Structure 1
Amino acid sequence: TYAQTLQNIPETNVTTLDNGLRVASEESSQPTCTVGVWIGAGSRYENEKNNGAGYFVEHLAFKGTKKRPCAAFEKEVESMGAHFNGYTSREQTAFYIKALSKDMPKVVELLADVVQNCALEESQIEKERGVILQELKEMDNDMTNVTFDYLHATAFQGTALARTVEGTTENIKHLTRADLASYIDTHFKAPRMVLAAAGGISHKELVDAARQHFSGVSFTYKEDAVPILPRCRFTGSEIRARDDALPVAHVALAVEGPGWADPDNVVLHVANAIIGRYDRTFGGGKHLSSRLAALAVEHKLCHSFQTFNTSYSDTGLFGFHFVADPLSIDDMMFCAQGEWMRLCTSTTESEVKRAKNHLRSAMVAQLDGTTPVCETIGSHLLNYGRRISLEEWDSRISAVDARMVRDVCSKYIYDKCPALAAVGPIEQLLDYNRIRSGMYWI
């Protein structure tokens, strides 16, 4: 029974290493497991000349280490059935491995090696250069993203956040064994990292292995100092990339967010739960509960749309993104901005109750497996400081009510200048002004 199953979930253990780094884990009766290093690094922490290092690095983090080059490293990992994966976004890089709880320790070693003693054989770089260079030309055709990026690039413009996590085309072309080093150098440091694990592992056993390979001690106090980032200025504006030869069109609209810390992020989510999401394959179709959805069917408004609450350390982007035919863009937008409004004005207790029960399931969902748990933990700590339990989250959610939503949405949505990203055959979206006004009264 719910109310109870939430407590039985084993508390997550956290103990920091006297050298800055931290360790956390959730032990379960599972044979398999997952562990990884969640570095608080990103494209935000980059700059004009280096833009793209954290990615170029992410690329060379597996082509060997000094201790054991490409062949052996790869061989060593495949041969034990482990899965070494990882990513790297604007404010969070992460390298993690999936394997039998048996390899628990031996694993850490690997992780540890990669971050610290990464090979960086200059012969492999000139090879990884042409690679990224392709990943761009290929990622350069995923409008859903091309959009979000452009969205960021204007939402923040003239700030670190307005940068692609893949970096410029130039940077990729000229980055050097040098700078690549520098990034890892300056960025991959103990305090700014979290060793996370969940599966059939005892905090003890784990914590130790870390104490064994994560031994690098800090002398001064500066090596203990977590660099605070210069905030990014939000700018109500728009960027329109027109190409009428594009089959469909993408549109992203957003407002400045509150940042990881702020509690309202929860509310904001409950909200997004109400406007939900949709793609032409949802089966509920005209009967769906999200008013925006339904209409999108009753009028063929779009192809897909989604509400998102991206949260960064000190900021965030709140909004929605839809894809649609060149001739329904308008109606669609209209309806969307509309719904948004209703949020601040006539949201009901039924809409919330539903949104809450949806959110609950959505949160629980993010923790389906080991990989998804360490991700959360790697994140929770790094971002929130502590680690929030489903029992906590849940309560924080049960506390929200209609009245509460209308107030928070009103706070971050009502009469605010927003950021707009239009890409494709967008001759119908037109005029910020109009789009602006759609930010009040409804």
Structure 2
Amino acid sequence: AEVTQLSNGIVVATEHNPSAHTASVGVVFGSGAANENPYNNGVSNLWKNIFLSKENSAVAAKEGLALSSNISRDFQSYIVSSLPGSTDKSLDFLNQSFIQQKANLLSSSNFEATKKSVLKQVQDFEDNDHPNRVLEHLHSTAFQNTPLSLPTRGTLESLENLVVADLESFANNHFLNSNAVVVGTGNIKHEDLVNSIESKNLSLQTGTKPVLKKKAAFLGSEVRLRDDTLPKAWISLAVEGEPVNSPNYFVAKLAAQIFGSYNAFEPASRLQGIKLLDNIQEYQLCDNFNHFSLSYKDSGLWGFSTATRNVTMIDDLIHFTLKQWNRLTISVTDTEVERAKSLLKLQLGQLYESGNPVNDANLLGAEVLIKGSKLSLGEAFKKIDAITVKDVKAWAGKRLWDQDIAIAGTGQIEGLLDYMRIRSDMSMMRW
């Protein structure tokens, strides 16, 4: 449970955990899809794909190393996993690919074979992964004409028109030092890694900063992707949430836990202590749903997602759910808040502490990049337990009560009523 981080030339961050069996090293950049443009959208996803290409991947495999990378909105990360002993051979492969081979990975035979893969990849996504496709579109309309609206995997149109020069252009503007953090998780010590790094000098484009832009903003709107040939209806709905490093980051995350997630087929799920289940189970209004409090640097999204085959009662699904959310402003109970506290701790635990160093790396790098440090799991619990009913009520009265929303859906959505109908349910009549 130690968050160690020191700066010499490069800001090095590590979180050691003795019993681990393995160790992971890599760099995480403070720039992701939210830094691209509508036309070069998909560059970051492309980088990730070449970094994992058959050529580069075969080199580290001989050495007994494994590769992993993830593209997000605010950040990007390249990671190399290894045994606790080869904690040095990872640092060689890292520098070899980001300085020496930052021109060998971009050959006219590799880039074309990779481009052909992300194209079949992103296409496959839009053709079949409906729930994620919808959540991606939710960000698209909620933050339109603003950074957060750009899909992480990029659009098929900005992708097929992307050239090697664009990769370089992006890389030379974001893969800088002042916008980077070298992460090390697994078992290796902070002082073990920091030495192998402060050994090899060379700055490589120092003093350079990435370009700036215009702040992200929420806009009440919707995008309806009707498709009557699909067998279900997938919809996502949300209000403007909380950004990371916000006084209410936790109240919000707790508020989502109150309604939580559900799966109509799993017996135990049907028994949960969520009032909403009394309303939706009578006529079986949906196969599943899940609330969330997504947070980013400039903004966030608080809402839920759901999938259903009861295409003639979608208005009741949406109506009941939004009536429950009304309660957070006027009648949420102590026991509901308490049930949430326990469950939030359990999930926040399983995330920050799993048996996989790669997840730890991403989380560590991402956090240190936005707030210059990581909040310890124990420090979180103290904040979570401190939340009162009054807090939830004040938060909801600001974020949920009579506030614009964003909607997105695909499939048999004829039954999803108009905007103003849904919008009206964000409140209740009173004397």
TM-score range, shorter chain: over 0.9
| One-letter identity of the residue aligned with 1:42 | G
What is the CA distance between 1:294 and its match in structure 2?
4.6
Question: Which runs of 5 or more structure 2 residues have no equivalent in the other structure?
Answer: none
CA shift, 1:80, in A, is 4.2
Q: Give the equivalent residue in structure 1 for 2:337.
A: 352
Q: Deviations over 1:332-358 (max 9, x none)?
A: 111111111111221111111110111
2:224 to 240, 246, 249: 240
**2:223 alignment partner AA:** I
- Deviations 1:7-26 (Å, cap 9, x if unpaired)? xx3x21101132x4433332
C-alpha contact (below 8 Å) 2:14/2:183 kept by paired residues: yes
1:25 corresponding residue in structure 2? 15
Query: Is 1:301 matched up with 2:292?
Result: no
Query: 1:147 Cα shift?
Result: 0.5
Out of 319, 322, 334, the position equivalent to 2:303 is 319
- Which residue is 1:6 aligned to? none
Alpha-carbon distance change, 214 to 138 in structure 1, aligned in 2, over 3 angstroms: farther
Name the counterpart of 2:5: 14
Question: Cα deviation per residue 1:119-176 (whole Å; 9 max; x = unaligned)?
Answer: 2112111112221111122101111111112111110111122122222222211211
Aligned pair partner of 2:27 in 26, 37, 42: 37
Q: 2:235 aligns with which of 251, 254, 257?
A: 251
Who is 2:118 aligned against?
Answer: 132
Secondary structure (helix, strand or coil) at the match of 2:421 reads helix
Distance change in 2, residues 1:121/1:243 (3 Å): same
User: Match for 1:342 among 324, 327, 332?
Assistant: 327
SS in 2 for 1:361: helix
1:155 and 2:142 aligned: yes
User: Partner amino acid for 2:116?
Assistant: G
Partner letter of residue 276 of structure 1?
G
Which of 262, 265, 272 aligns to 2:256? It is 272
Structure-to-structure mapping, 1:271-420, within 5 angstroms: 271-325=255-309, 326-366=311-351, 367-369=353-355, 370-420=357-407
Structure 1 residue 120 and structure 2 residue 106: aligned? yes
Q: Counterpart amino acid of 1:86?
A: S
Q: How far off its partner does 1:258 sit?
A: 2.4
Shift of 1:227: 5.2
Question: Are the structure 2 counterparts of residues 377 and 229 from structure 1 closer, same or farther at C-alpha, using a change threshold of 3 Å?
Answer: farther
Aligned partners of 1:214, 1:191: CA distance in 2, in Å? 16
Match runs of 1:70-149 below 5 Å: 70=55, 73-116=56-99, 117-118=101-102, 119-140=105-126, 141-149=128-136
Go from structure 1 to structure 2 and tell me whether the alpha carbon gap of 1:423 and 1:277 turns closer, same or farther (over 3 Å shift).
same
Q: Which deviates the most, 371-380 or 252-261?
A: 371-380
Contact 1:24 1:196 in 2 (8 A): yes
In the alignment, the residues of structure 2 paired with residue 179 and residue 54 of structure 1 have an alpha-carbon distance, to the nearest angstrom, of: 10
How many residue pairs were aligned?
422
More off after superposition, 270-279 vs 101-110: 101-110
User: Cα–Cα, structure 1 residues 115 and 299, in superposed 2: closer, same or farther, change >3 Å?
Assistant: farther
Letter of the 1:390 counterpart:
L
| 1:49 corresponding residue in structure 2 | 39
Equivalent residues of 2:176, 2:205 under 8 A apart: no
Hey, what's the Cα distance between the residues in 1 that align with 2:205 and 2:77?
A: 22
Give the TM-score, by structure 2 length.
0.93
Secondary structure of 1:298's counterpart equals: coil
Query: 3-state DSSP class of the match of 1:38?
Result: strand
Distance 1:139 1:160, change over 3 A: same
- Contact between 1:38 and 1:379, CA under 8 Å: does it hold in 2? yes
Q: 1:182 aligns with which of 169, 179, 196?
A: 169
| Residues 1:217 and 1:59: Cα distance change in structure 2 (over 3 Å) | closer
Indicate conservation of the 8 Å contact 2:122/2:155, yes or no. no
Q: Is the 8 A contact 1:277 1:304 kept in 2?
A: yes
User: 1:307, CA displacement in angstroms?
Assistant: 0.6
One-letter amino acid of the counterpart of residue 315, structure 1: S
Contact 1:254 1:419 in 2 (8 A): yes
CA distance in 2: counterparts of 1:115 and 1:295, whole angstroms: 55
| Residues 212-223 of structure 1 aligned to structure 2 (within 5 Å) | 212-213=199-200, 215-216=202-203, 221=207, 223=208
Stretches of structure 1 lacking an aligned partner (at least 5 in a row): 1-8, 65-69
Counterpart in the other structure of 1:4: none
Would the aligned equivalents of 1:27 and 1:203 in 2 still touch at CA under 8 Å?
A: no
* Aligned-residue RMSD, C-alpha: 1.9
Distance 1:296 1:197, change over 3 A: farther
Partner amino acid, structure 1, of 2:337: V
Report the alpha carbon displacement of residue 438 of structure 1 after superposing the two structures with TM: 0.6
**How far 1:218 sits from its partner (Å)?**
5.6
Provide Cα deviations, 1:163-220, integer angstroms capped at 9, x if missing partner: 222222222112111011111111111221222222221111201222245732565x
